[PDB]
Amino acid sequence: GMERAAFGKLVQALRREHRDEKGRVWTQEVLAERTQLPKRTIERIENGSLAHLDADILLRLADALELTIGERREFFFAATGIIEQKSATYKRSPEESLQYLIDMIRNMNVPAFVTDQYVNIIAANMITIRFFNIPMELIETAPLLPHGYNLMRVVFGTEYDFRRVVGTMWDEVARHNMQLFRAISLRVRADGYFVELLDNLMQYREFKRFWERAHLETEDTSAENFWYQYTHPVYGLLSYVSSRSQIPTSMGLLSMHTYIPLSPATTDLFAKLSTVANQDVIRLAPWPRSNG
Ligand SMILES: CCCCCCCCCCCCCC(=O)O
Ligand SMILES: [Cl-]
């Protein structure tokens, strides 16, 4: 769950991601109109001065804001989730939590990487780098861009041609990654850094295209594994499943992404890539991003 003021700032950020029929940013009046609610109610929700948020209001807001199935789930929980009297306790500190995920992906002989609350890539083992054949210059120049290490920059960016790698599977893979991005980021949409991140991602024509279409999907894949099956332009026929595990920290969530091989040729490819040089993890986006 969330405090009323934080939830209010979330509604404001979600509203401001929209443009009406005349291309204007949605005002409180427009959100009021689309939800058939009084402007004062939208005003009180956004200021966090409304103690109780009933189901009709929340459903009207989720419907008007055209949230994805994954976003609806996160949005409703941010509004109705019971906050405990005692603050959450964690076995490991944020630093020990990331180090624990790094120590684990270092020991895997399959591609594995870590993302945070903005879906920025925090760390990756060298098997991931070798598998995706990421130019080392693109890693070197990622600190110079606000969206430089974002998973959406890899999938939808112009510098690395991910569409070429997955080929005919592009629509499916881009749809799934858009669903993941939108459901994971839902809780941090009012963050100044997220607003900046979204504006940079919106400069990519293909990101915008999949973003505006995302709510039309009737099937949710954001909380599920994706089974990749395609002819890779250089590795040939591959078959593998990507899994995402989440861990909570006092500085926001951490996600671990792993790719399990599902064919002898994919098994052999991952085994060859784990052999090359040795087991190592490359540090990418700094974490926590704003450590305080
Ligand atoms: C350019 C900065 C990031 C450098 C390395 C990132 C490695 C992560 C690869 C991400 C591709 C995953 C997308 C997918 O499987 O659908
Ligand atoms: Cl390649």
Author numbering: 0 to 291
The paper states:
MltR consists of two domains, a small helical DNA-binding domain (DBD, residues 1-80) and a larger α/β C-terminal ligand-binding domain (LBD, residues 92–291). In conclusion, we have determined the crystal structure of a novel transcription factor that is a representative of a large group of regulators with significant implications in antibiotic production and fatty-acid biosynthesis.
Each monomer contains residues 0 to 291 (residue Gly0 is the residue that remains after cleavage of the N-terminal purification tag) and one fatty acid tentatively assigned as myristic acid (MYR). Each dimer is arranged in a side-to-side arrangement with the DBDs at one end and the LBDs at the other, resulting in a relatively flat arrangement with molecular dimension of 75 Å × 73 Å × 48 Å. MYR interacts favorably with the protein such that its carboxyl group is stabilized by hydrogen bonding interactions with Tyr227, Tyr258, and Asn176, and its hydrophobic tail is surrounded by hydrophobic side chains in the interior of the protein. Thus, conformational changes are required for MYR (or other ligands) to gain access to the binding site.
